[PDB]
Paper text:
Using the DslA structure as a guide, we next monitored the activity of DslA mutants for the putative active-site residues. Variants E143Q and E154Q clearly fold and retain a similar active-site architecture (as judged by our high-resolution structures herein), but display no notable activity (middle), confirming their participation in catalysis. The lysozyme superfamily has a conserved ES motif at the C terminus of a central α-helix, which is readily identifiable as E143/S144 on DslA helix D. Residue E143 of the conserved ES motif would act as a general acid, protonating the equatorial linkage between MurNAc and GlcN, with E154 acting as a general base to activate water to attack the MurNAc C1 in an axial orientation. The structural equivalence of DslA E154 to the β1 secondary catalytic acid residues of goose-type lysozymes (also GH23, but with a second catalytic residue lacking in the lytic transglycosylases), v-type lysozymes and chitosanases, and our assay on the E143Q and E154Q mutants argues for an inverting hydrolytic mechanism for DslA. All four of our DslA structures (two wild-type, E143Q, E154Q) are highly similar, other than a relatively small flexation of the β1–2 hairpin in the E154Q variant. Additional controls were performed using EDTA plus DslA with one of the catalytic site residues inactivated (E143Q), or using conventional hen egg-white lysozyme (HEWL) or buffer only. The percentage of prematurely released, external predator cells increased significantly when early bdelloplasts were treated by exogenous addition of DslA, whereas no significant change was detected for the treatment controls DslA E143Q, HEWL or buffer only.
Numbering used by the authors: 0 to 181
C-alpha cells in the first residue's frame, strides 16, 4: 500500500530489494533524518509535516532514487575521478550508486573495508542514509545555501546544490510533485 515507489524499481532487476534494504536501514541509520521537519519543506515537500513515519520513509527512498538517477543512472559499478585530492594527494574517486568516496564516506562511519564495498549497492545506499542523517538533522533542512554555506545533503552532494542544472531542477520538481507532498 505504498503511495510512492522509488525510481530504481522501474528498470533495475534488484530494485525492489534495494527498496526493502533502504526502508529497513532507515530505521537503524536514519532515525534523526526521519525526526526532522525541514525548513525548506516549502520547496521540496510542502506537506512534509503531515507525513506518517511510513510516508517519510517512502519519501526519503524516492529522493535517494532521484539522486542515484543523476549520480550514476543506477549503475553500481560506476566510478568517476574528481577534480580534487584526498588527504594523501591522490584524486578522489567517487563510487557506486550515490557517488560516494571512501575517505569522506568513512568519516560518517560507513565502515567501507575496501573500495569494492562502495560498489556494493546496499552498503552504498546505507552510507547515503548516514550522510543525510548527520546533515539534514544538524542543519534542519534538506539542501540550500544559508549565509554562504551549503546545508543538509548539499553539504556532501553537488547534485543537491541549487543551480541551473537539469539534475537539481528535476530532483526538486519530482519531490515537490509527489502525491504525498503536494
Amino acid at each position: 500500500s505504498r503511495e510512492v515507489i522509488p525510481l530504481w524499481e522501474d528498470k533495475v532487476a534488484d530494485g525492489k530489494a534495494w527498496s526493502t534494504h533502504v526502508y529497513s536501514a532507515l530505521d537503524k541509520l536514519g532515525p534523526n533524518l526521519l525526526d526532522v521537519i525541514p525548513a525548506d519543506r516549502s520547496l521540496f515537500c510542502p506537506k512534509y509535516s503531515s507525513l506518517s513515519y511510513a510516508q517519510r520513509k517512502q519519501y526519503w527512498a524516492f529522493v535517494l532514487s532521484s539522486m542515484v538517477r543523476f549520480q550514476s543512472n543506477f549503475k553500481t559499478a560506476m566510478s568517476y575521478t574528481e577534480d580534487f585530492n584526498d588527504s594523501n594527494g591522490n584524486r578522489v574517486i567517487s563510487r557506486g550508486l550515490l557517488q560516494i568516496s571512501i575517505e569522506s564516506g568513512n568519516a560518517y562511519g560507513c565502515g567501507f573495508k575496501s573500495t569494492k564495498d562502495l560498489h556494493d549497492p546496499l552498503q552504498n545506499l546505507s552510507c547515503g542514509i548516514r550522510i543525510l542523517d548527520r546533515w539534514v538533522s544538524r542543519d534542519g533542512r534538506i539542501a540550500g545555501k544559508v549565509d554562504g554555506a551549503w546545508k543538509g545533503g548539499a553539504r556532501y552532494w553537488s547534485v543537491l546544490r541549487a543551480g541551473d542544472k537539469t539534475s537539481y531542477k528535476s530532483i526538486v520538481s519530482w519531490s515537490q510533485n509527489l502525491s504525498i507532498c503536494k
